[PDB]
Amino acid sequence: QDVVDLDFFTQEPLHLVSPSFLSVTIDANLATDPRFLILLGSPKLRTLARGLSPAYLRFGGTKTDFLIFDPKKE
Amino acid sequence: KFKNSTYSRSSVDVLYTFANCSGLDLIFGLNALLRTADLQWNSSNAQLLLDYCSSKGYNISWELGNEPNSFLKKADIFINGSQLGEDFIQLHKLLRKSTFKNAKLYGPDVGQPRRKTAKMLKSFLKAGGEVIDSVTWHHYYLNGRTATREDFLNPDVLDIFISSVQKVFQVVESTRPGKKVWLGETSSAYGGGAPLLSDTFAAGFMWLDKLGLSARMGIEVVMRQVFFGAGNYHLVDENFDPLPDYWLSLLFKKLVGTKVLMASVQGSKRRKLRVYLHCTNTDNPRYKEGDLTLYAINLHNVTKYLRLPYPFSNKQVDKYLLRPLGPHGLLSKSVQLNGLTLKMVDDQTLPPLMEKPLRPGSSLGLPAFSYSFFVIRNAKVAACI
Ligand SMILES: O=C(O)C1=C[C@H](O)[C@@H](OS(=O)(=O)O)[C@H](O[C@H]2[C@H](O)[C@@H](NS(=O)(=O)O)[C@@H](O[C@H]3[C@H](O)[C@@H](O)[C@H](O[C@H]4[C@H](O)[C@@H](NS(=O)(=O)O)[C@H](O)O[C@@H]4COS(=O)(=O)O)O[C@H]3C(=O)O)O[C@@H]2COS(=O)(=O)O)O1
Ligand SMILES: *[C@@H]1O[C@H](CO)[C@@H](O)[C@H](O)[C@H]1NC(C)=O
Ligand SMILES: *[C@@H]1O[C@H](CO)[C@@H](O)[C@H](O)[C@H]1NC(C)=O
Ligand SMILES: *[C@@H]1O[C@H](CO)[C@@H](O)[C@H](O)[C@H]1NC(C)=O
Ligand SMILES: [Cl-]
């Protein structure tokens, strides 16, 4: 038989998650792609991203530790 | 395998404006492998970046290092947790001297808590825990290179996540009790994802289960690897089209609130039928304070029918059942919501997410190998007001 009874605990919240609980990353590796500006400029991608707001966007990954800021580069 | 490369002011601007225009909060990972002859962190490059960001008025949160447990393998440099902790203290002093003196700092972005990683996290938190705002760690279930379809559907694989979470909290509660714990990078499979699996409907069992368990167990934020990128585990592909996990994520966002409750199955079979319960998201215009959102995963090969308990048995329920669009079944990259394909309306417009109202008092139908959200209307749960 395939009918299942649920039990619910509803007396008080067991935990409180952030409003940004479901957040996302962009991998550091993407900033080595020649077309980074085209990619993240996409209005379509921004629309998709807005849908997950509020959220954190974390920029990082393995390449975090092999990237150096160079203020002169174009 | 890892060479140094540089990034520019332009790149920083691209990233910030993407986040800013999207309503997202940017967390930027700084390079921890810049070292003095003493093996201290050399902060000079981070200083350049901080000053630049300050000068543009960018509100940004910071991390330092990624998977420092792997530095010996990646770079032949070993940095112990104590030293890393001192490096975080130095970064925190720079932030306190910056234009954004209250900017947040997260770390240490360790991998999952194997014996050696657990010891590094422990010594890190003893040394640097006072200055981090949340503890970050990473989790992947499988190696993408060898992952199988069967692994994506296996509750014994899903269940391994529980033990990693418990180990992280054991370390944190022994050192910095009460500090928030975040999953700072997570996905199905590492090595960029499992080909033909991590970008499909079948990926959603892992994603939704991880969300459910994370919320249930006290994790405050989960960061999905990756929104957009070269790996198979992307939410959005290289044509800027959303994959099933995007649509799953959007539904979760719209329906699932911040207050976590609990559901379980009376039977106690409890492995292939997986159930989670929160208060409904109060920003959803359709629903009101006191409503509940149940979400469920059915990894059986037959339909299961769920019965709600008193006093919710006769309430109006809105169903949001996700199924793949054929012919590729679980390996599909397209999904339907209550029988309608989810697709962008145009480049600026997400579709509406249409509910299916059920007959009051009916049992909740959950087909084989599927997941669904169920909003219980007028539930009037005092804990959710
Ligand atoms: O998908 C590709 O484009 C791609 C295909 C290559 O085959 C693949 O190389 S691999 O098969 O030899 O691994 C490579 O994968 C990239 C991946 O595309 C990229 N993400 S992105 O968004 O698409 O740019 C990135 O992801 C990694 C994260 O940066 C990193 O924080 C985390 O760490 C893993 C660690 O890498 C992993 N080793 S492995 O990747 O070599 O297999 C280790 O075993 O687990 C870590 C997690 O620890 S934990 O489970 O204990 O928590 O995830 C990475 C990830 O693997 O996805 O880089 C990868 C790897 O690039 S590479 O140069 O190291 O090979 O590109
Ligand atoms: C840190 O790095 C910079 C640039 O690479 C170098 O010139 C500087 O002397 C270093 N600082 C220390 C304290 O070693
Ligand atoms: C950690 O590393 C530092 C810097 O290399 C070293 O001086 C210190 O003794 C190490 N701590 C432990 C516990 O080994
Ligand atoms: C479900 O799983 C079992 C595996 O033991 C199989 O024998 C059974 O026929 C399957 N049912 C369906 C409906 O495919
Ligand atoms: Cl079972």
Coordinates of C-alpha atoms and ligand atoms in Angstrom, one line a residue, chain A residues 68, chain B residues 34-38 40-45 48, ligand 2:
Chain A
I68 CA 46.3 38.9 -8.0
Chain B
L34 CA 50.6 35.6 -0.9
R35 CA 53.1 34.8 1.8
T36 CA 56.1 36.6 3.5
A37 CA 59.5 34.8 4.1
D38 CA 58.2 34.2 7.7
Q40 CA 52.7 35.2 7.3
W41 CA 50.0 36.4 5.0
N42 CA 51.2 39.3 2.9
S43 CA 48.3 41.7 2.9
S44 CA 49.6 44.2 0.4
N45 CA 47.6 43.2 -2.7
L48 CA 45.2 47.6 -3.0
Ligands
LIG2 C1 54.4 41.8 0.0 O1 54.4 41.7 -1.5 C2 54.8 42.9 -2.2 C3 54.5 42.8 -3.7 O2 54.6 41.4 -4.2 C4 56.3 43.0 -1.8 O3 57.0 44.0 -2.6 C5 56.4 43.4 -0.3 O4 57.7 43.7 0.0 C6 55.8 42.2 0.5 N1 55.7 42.5 1.9 C7 56.3 41.8 2.9 C8 56.0 42.2 4.3 O5 57.1 40.8 2.7

